[PDB]
Write a protein that binds this ligand. Structure first.
Ligand SMILES: Cc1cc2nc3c(=O)[nH]c(=O)nc-3n(C[C@H](O)[C@H](O)[C@H](O)COP(=O)(O)OP(=O)(O)OC[C@H]3O[C@@H](n4cnc5c(N)ncnc54)[C@H](O)[C@@H]3O)c2cc1C
Ligand SMILES: [Ca+2]
Length: 420
């Protein structure tokens, strides 16, 4: 009503607030630091970078590169701060963390339409409100969210298995079927006893992580994620010794995860192991497995592609809380949530970028992905439609970059009111 609330002044909240301010909407920005600190933060600055100083690859074949370009086109404060705080990095956008957060803090605090409240928010603020409290959302607010939307719709940890691009799978080595109690729609990669022997040992030499389960017993994976019972390999007419199952994560079916392969392994180790699996020898991993302390919402059950809560008009989520991972992804979802909150205040319906753009692909995934055990997502090429034709993958990716950027730009140009 009076000011739009933004809760959390991290990557997402800072961009959401800036977007609101640019559109002339008064903001009340809550930040608990430094009255209360998270386990990861060390300063009282807005948009503090808590770990790596990289915002991702800048290249035209890089999905993060496309998102960076989109955010610049959008006039992002995070991208402005990043460009001005650049430090050397081959192919990646990397920043002087202190200069980055210092600049953002000064530009926001200096804005006449911004009120900053240095307090912990313990209940969802009434009115028009963007929640952007991040992976270390205070326990009070996490509790409040559980009370409002359901215990099972907020997680405190992620445990994500690797997701591969469907088109990169050798389907001649797989079969579609389900075990007892499963959908008949899982993809099954059968393995012989000898193949399992080598795979098990590889896991040892590389929620409980799958590699740890393997360490605990030879048969543990065979009772669990690699269980073959109730499956018949059409090729042999027999039950396989073991399988790796894949399940569809996205609505479009471009993105399939390895079932029960949540892992904390280094990304290069994950790639090497995955490519041992029959059918996945040349698989392209678009989202690597991780296991982190990470508070986030079940976006597919709770949020629209507009980042507005489906059952709470004028309430939005952005950043890690909304189900993304990455500084840039958090800033970008902050932009969209701030944009839609501003539009709401003004009496205009919410918007979302096209499925061809990286931000559009990201938020559409959040809203439409498989809700069961939903895990966070970062920018990747699986999120957008393929490029048809018989070109090389590099050329195809460049085409997806150009197509997405043009589509995002056209979308921006159509906005009324326009971003100044
Ligand atoms: C340990 C760790 C390392 C990470 N390393 C990387 C990395 O290397 N690269 C990468 O891309 N991403 C990394 N991330 C993941 C993620 O991209 C970042 O956490 C990113 O900053 C998320 O942006 P955000 O705005 O959603 O959350 P944050 O930047 O954490 O901002 C949330 C803000 O909300 C505040 N807040 C929380 N609760 C309340 C409350 N109730 N009231 C008021 N304020 C509140 C917090 O103090 C914080 O300022 C890391 C995360 C963690 C936890
Ligand atoms: Ca500089």
């Amino acid at each position: 009503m009076e000011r739009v609330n933004v809760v959390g002044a991290g990557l997402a909240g800072s961009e959401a607030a800036w977007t609101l301010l640019r559109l002339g909407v008064p903001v009340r920005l809550f930040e608990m630091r430094p009255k209360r600190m998270t386990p990861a933060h060390g300063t009282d600055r807005f948009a503090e970078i808590v770990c790596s100083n990289s915002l991702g690859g800048e290249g035209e074949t890089n999905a993060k590169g496309l998102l960076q370009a989109e955010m610049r086109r959008a006039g992002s404060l995070v991208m402005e701060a990043a460009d001005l705080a650049r430090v050397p990095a081959g192919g990646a956008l990397a920043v002087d963390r202190e200069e980055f957060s210092g600049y953002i803090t000064e530009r926001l605090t200096g804005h006449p339409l911004l009120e900053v409240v240095r307090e912990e928010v313990r209940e969802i603020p009434p009115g028009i409100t963007v929640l952007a409290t991040g992976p270390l959302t205070s326990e009070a607010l996490a509790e409040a969210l559980k009370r409002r939307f359901g215990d099972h719709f907020l997680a405190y940890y992620d445990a994500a298995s690797p997701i591969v691009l469907y088109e990169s799978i050798d389907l001649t080595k797989c079969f579609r079927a389900g075990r007892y109690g499963q959908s008949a729609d899982y993809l099954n990669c059968p393995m012989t006893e000898e193949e399992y022997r080598r795979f098990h040992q590889a896991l040892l030499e590389a929620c409980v992580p799958v590699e740890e389960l393997a360490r605990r017993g030879y048969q543990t994976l065979l009772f669990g994620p690699m269980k073959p019972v109730g499956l018949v390999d059409p090729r042999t007419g027999k039950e396989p010794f073991a399988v790796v199952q894949l399940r569809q994560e996205d609505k479009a079916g471009r993105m399939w995860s390895l079932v029960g392969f949540q892992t904390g392994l280094k990304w290069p180790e994950q790639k090497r192991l995955i490519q041992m699996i029959p059918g996945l020898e040349n698989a392209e991993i678009v989202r690597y497995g991780v296991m982190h302390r990470n508070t986030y919402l079940n976006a597919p059950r709770l949020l629209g592609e507009t980042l507005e809560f489906r059952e709470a008009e004028g309430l939005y989520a952005a950043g890690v809380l909304a189900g993304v991972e990455g500084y840039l992804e958090s800033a970008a979802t902050g932009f969209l949530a701030g944009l839609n909150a501003a539009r709401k205040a003004l009496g205009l319906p919410p918007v979302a970028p096209p499925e061809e753009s990286m931000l559009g692909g990201l938020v559409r995934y959040l809203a439409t992905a498989n809700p069961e055990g939903f895990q966070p997502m970062y920018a990747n090429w699986g999120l957008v439609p393929p490029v048809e034709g018989r070109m090389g993958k590099k050329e195809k990716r460049q085409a997806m970059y150009r197509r997405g950027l043009e589509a995002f730009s056209a979308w921006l140009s159509g906005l009324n009111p326009p971003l100044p």
